[PDB]
Amino acid sequence: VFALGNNLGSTDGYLATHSQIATKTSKPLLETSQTVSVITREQIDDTASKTVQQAMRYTPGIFTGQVGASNRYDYVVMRGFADNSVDNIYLDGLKAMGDSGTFSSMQVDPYFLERIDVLKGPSSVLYGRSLPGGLVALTSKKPLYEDYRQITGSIGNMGQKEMGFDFSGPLDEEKRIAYRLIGLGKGSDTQFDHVKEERYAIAPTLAIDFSDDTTLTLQGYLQHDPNGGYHGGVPADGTLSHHNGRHISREFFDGEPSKDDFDRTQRMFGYQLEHRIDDVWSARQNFRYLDSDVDLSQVYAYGWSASEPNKLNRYFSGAREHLQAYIVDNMLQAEFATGAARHTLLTGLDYQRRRTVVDWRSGSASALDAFNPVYGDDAISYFPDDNHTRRLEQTGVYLQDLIDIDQWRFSLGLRQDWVSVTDKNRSTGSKADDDWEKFTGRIGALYLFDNGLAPYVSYSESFNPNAYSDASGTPLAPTEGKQWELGLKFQAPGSNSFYTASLFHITQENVASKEPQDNFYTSVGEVRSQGLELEAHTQLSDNLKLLGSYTYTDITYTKSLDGNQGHTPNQAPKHMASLWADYAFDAGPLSGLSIGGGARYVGETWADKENTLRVPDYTLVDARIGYDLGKLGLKGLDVSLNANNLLDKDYVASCYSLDFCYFGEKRNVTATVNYQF
Template sequence: MNSGHRIAGTALLLAGMAPIAVAAQSGDTPESVQLAPLNVIGQAATKAETPFLETPQSVSEITREEMEEQGARTVQEAARYTPGVFAGQIGASKRYDYMVLRGFSDGSIDNVYLDGLKMLGDPGTFSTLQIDPYFLESAEVVKGPASVLYGRASPGGIVALTSKQPRFSSHREIQLGVGTQAQRQAAFDFTDRIGDSGRAAYRLTGLASRSDTQFDKLEQERYALAPSLTLNLSEATSLTLQAYLQDDPEGGSHSGLPAEGTLYPRNGRTISNNFFEGEPDYELFERTQRMLGYQLEHAFNDSWSVRQNFRYLNSDVRLQQVYAFGWASPTELNRYYSGADESLEAYAVDNQLQGEFATGALRHTLLMGVDYQRRRADVAWPSGSFPPIDAFDPEYGADPIAIGPAQRQDRELDQLGVYLQDQIALGNWRFTLGGRQDRVDIANRNPDTGTEDAGDWRQFSGRAGALYLFDNGLAPYASYSESFNPNSYADADGDLLEPTEGRQYELGMKFQPPGSASQVTASLFHIEQENVATREPQESFYRPVGEIRSRGFELESQLHVTGGLFLRGGYSYTEAKIHEAADGTEGNYSNMAPRHQASLWGTYFFDQGALDGLEAGLGVRHIADLWADDENTRKVPDYTLVDASMRYDLESIGIQGLSARLNVHNLFDKEYVASCYSLNYCYYGDERSVTATVSYDF
């Protein structure tokens, strides 16, 4: 049986489990995992509280519990079991959260939002920010264009993170962890009300971690702190003040190797998946990021309320990297040098007015908003060359052949958007209509030469959706949505490229039986994106590609099969093709966009005998039909990975608040190439890692 048939069989099996899950609702559920009927409230897809069944768009939620159970060390790892998300774009690198959504790898580090506001890193530089998952309460993956609410965005979707918020009840946690690759981590999370008035609560979360990586001579290190304070200023007004401070003195690996030697042998030899092609004395990645913000909300009455979210951020990045590009001899790789000294400053504000009212038989949830973003980055990029290195018997200690003067840029972006959305209920019908007008100004200046590349764009984005709620829990829907993303990228002549524009048509079916904690989503989508650009890592300019079309099918299920068994399964078929191109790739499949992805994670809660308090989890991920280059000359071999988790709550033996967890990624230590940017840059995937964590709640 070929891989496509196997994956399709898995998808049908997952869909067939839904009746089992429904039948299981009448059975007994252990008290330790008692489940209320699930009514997921989506914020990211509508910026308003909308139940799972009433959102005419495919949205996946990743909970705090799932992040812990799967041992997610980054946001991209937390999304590995989400259909439509490819999290292996740069393999084992954990420096940034790359997430390819519905086949679109462009902007895959620029589609992350935190508490409703864009993270505002600059994807044209090295200044992209990252949030540690320990500081998150949940994440939502909104699939498809979301520009009507968020402005510039990738047509594949967005990843919306929700940070841990202060609680008015006491919770204190201390966590210690160790593992392979010399992992060690300490973290704490404290929250409680302040005083007896019930008007103030705080939260203080912190983390320190350090580890080696699977690549020789490289380490990762992080220190982060997030204080927050919630004030109920009155019965109708609340204010939450937030800060996030993070220092990454070591950033691990971010390098690729040629396809010859990784995907297939070089003169009968394969490069080790631990190989470091750089120079220890010229390897540096330091990132410091600081964010300050608030969330203010006031209810005028039961129908109308106003919200304002604000965030200021700045970051500093220093980079030195010696990287490989092509073969210099039968055993040696050419090497070049790239450096960066960057400072980024940005802020964003989103003002919202929401009203709930009726006009005849129509019930409206009306959202009006104005948001503004401003970002400035000052960068300096030196470059040069290094002597070659033997990829099979490396020797380190070389000095550069030459390092040239730094290329400097001052990069600015301004975005102002006005949007309107109406969610309408008419009997069992649900309609969503929205529109937005944006103004975006971009300017890239060279302070040494005085030259400037600038552009300003005006863009309207629309959205429409319809959904029908059947009494048995079925909810078919159809939707149309648009996206745009102005380019801050320049071509070989230094001119800014035209904005990318996208549109999606989606048909789907959601299913959540009344009173059930299980849910299933199936969706068909068709996305078109124009004015796509790409860049080779060794080049400083971008090339226009043309138009990409992505279409496919996704199936996702969260099933409570028996009292103690929970399954999360998914399958996605994505056909991302280059529809128009001037470089000879027209009609080819896009690389970094696997055609087939399937995953299944199962958790079982033991509640009897000697195993009482034990939770065991096992997951399988499969990636198939992934091209290594847009020319479609080579494919990345299909790979299947197994992860495992085990948690024991020592309360079952009389020790209150103490629990221990063991997480294993890539259980069978499979060596594999996760993805290729081109035949010059292929990325090895994670080797096996084991982490043991002890948590004490008091």
């Protein structure tokens, strides 16, 4: 039923049986030599996660707090590696292709997805450039071959309101052409004064069966965000502590209302072609093109002003960016036997190409009182403009073999990569132009016991182009990740329960390092991240689903010129844990009702790489109640009330440095109505 490039599992409540993310071909999680979590549509809905980042808050090895209550972009820190977290997202097989070094990172609304898979650790062997911590792969909704219709409505605090629809179905008498059309409109004042978020999006999709051997899928995703919510940060002095006498509200807005814009338009046109050649061979081509636009205009705080007492030193930052990008992945796979051994041999060739045109304005703004701001003084005092064109190109050739034999599952992969990047400075004339070729390998071995236990060991690699440069303005060499993972998976034969343990050790080399006086880097640092991840999904009866996680992460700088040579980076909790439970009353008095709840604990973190100051820990509580009106004669209609951060904690979710600390989201309460067919 076509495994190449599909998950092809089966899902039941919060638990899926298979995935494609570690292998690029459907494999049962139990027989897969990597740590892989999967978050279902149902999980996303039950926790009322507004955002792919928020949707990961019950998953071990993941930190969701990088910018606190900001929703503009999706920051997912994996296994301690925060440094280019916007780039961890892949969509229908293919990297998202935002440009991490500009304001043009892309955002996928969760209403368009059906699933989210997380793969832990270095993963370049099938994806090219990526992070040492791993990757997140989103799977979008697809056309259906029986008629389906949903309409959905939401109201909330902070002025939240959402409407959305989702029609799918067969288009022809013979059920070989199918559509899906998904639309939404969405808005929020946030917790923060004078800010809106706003989105309108629509996703059409056509699915065409060609002979008995081919499917073609045409895809669009048009999204427009006329407002970007909030993306500010404030000093730790006055947030984790008192500044002179005061404390700095979690509703505080560091900008100017008359100069705060964030307008993002993102359009994707894509296709997936699946083709069966023989009983042995399959091919598959995935492709997507992205044309984005960002206009941005903001005044933002950078520390206390040194001459004015209770006011924040502030700057301006404008941008107009046009990004155009494309990505294609070609795969050819064979299923054949050599004696006792089953082989699944994959080769493929991918190609990425990205151009981004960026006109950046900047300058200084009047200072602003941090407790009793007076807005209005929006005159900017401009610095020199800074205009660039930026291109990247990556090309990969890769080979994988999955060898099955007796109770062993083995895994081999190689990949050759070619990366070119170039920056034209249209303001000063100058040009950077640099290219690297990289080789990556992965090897895994798992053993599948008769009773449902599956120990596995795995070795694996990543590379990623370095964000930083040397004294001559040349980029540093790419960073290299290497990981040994040792893991244990369990599912009892009968049950719908699943358990996982992973011990891992990751090394990151070529990390940028600077002597504090210097303003240019050298690639001479190293980071080591090791820890333990536990994950439980339990069906305790037919009415009760549980998810449990625990995460121990010891990440430090094992080599650093900055003076931080045994420190833990910021945004890296030593401990995290979570627990979520949904109860659905079967029969009796409360039939149709559902209650669920959860708790998430995040340990203390450092505010700074110097480790001079702690961010306190926090436990947040989320809750829900739902009712199925099908019980009472209105089949398909149901209704829910959700609350995240039920106890309305103030807290600093994290800091990026002592100058930039971020508040966690306050209590968020959404009530929802869905009518199906």
